[PDB]
Symmetry: C4
Subunit: 92 residues, 4 copies
């Protein structure tokens, strides 16, 4: 049983033009992910919830997160990505 | 024997264009028997894809040329785990 | 109750081009971060500290171009920075 | 005094077109750096020696390393950078 990655990741950049996080769950249990969006000038927003099933990768467009709320375009943001089980997160 | 790197790497991105590269350094004195597993968004992982990076050598691995057990589909998002018997350094470009 | 990042970061690259370079800092914690930046050069002593605050639960984009007290950073010059904080922060320079 | 970085760095990519390493020495002692260059089909070459003085940065063009030997253009390579004192290394 492959355990790789960690349960907490932070990405200090973010910008939607008027973007993409890639998550690997190589493990045997589904990952319940929560993402919190941070801003320069207002309180953070979340959790945005999503599942990356066991032995799957998922591409997350920040542009498509809209529950609790869409992320404003042309605004600089940062995100924290938390999970119950270790995942690998990369930002292109 | 210089030992640098680790035996397990994960790359969360992967895309072959429609119709990329992993750079591996083995700076040590024993050949590295590498296994790569490829993960997908909607189906079980595929692998292991096996290759050797000899002692004191680097190797460029095009995902496009990995085809045993199977070629990786184009225009498909994927992720890889790279495992080795001996520490290696892995860069994805 | 979120502590993430560290109090010390080093960026070995730095270039401001002609106009007429940026660092993103996340402070996910519950205390304001008093940051200090020291700028290093290939051929002279380092310059700093440049001071700024990243408040609790905020992110801040820092344009190196705008840093100018104690001194502006020369354009067309290769530099490096060290970013120190009283509390953990996350620093990325995409 | 400020100690930051480490004494060993590996860079798995390297290409000189027919290729810059930026090194920070934030410490109070000069860093005597040795670089070894690795190839896909021959023994490694080095050490290439250089100094990054106390409290200085240095840009290192792979194209300008030529003692013991120039690095061939149009060839894939990798490097190991070792130092007596910790340094911070970034590849571009």
């Amino acid at each position: 049983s492959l355990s790789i990655g960690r349960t907490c990741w932070a990405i200090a950049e973010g910008y939607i033009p008027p973007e993409t996080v890639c998550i690997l769950n190589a493990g045997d249990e589904d990952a319940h992910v929560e993402i919190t969006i941070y801003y320069s000038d207002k309180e953070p927003v979340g959790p945005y919830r999503l599942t990356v099933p066991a032995r799957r990768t998922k591409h997350v467009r920040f542009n498509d997160l809209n529950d609790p709320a869409p992320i404003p375009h042309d605004t600089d943001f940062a995100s924290v990505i938390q999970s119950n089980v270790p995942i690998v997160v990369q930002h292109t």
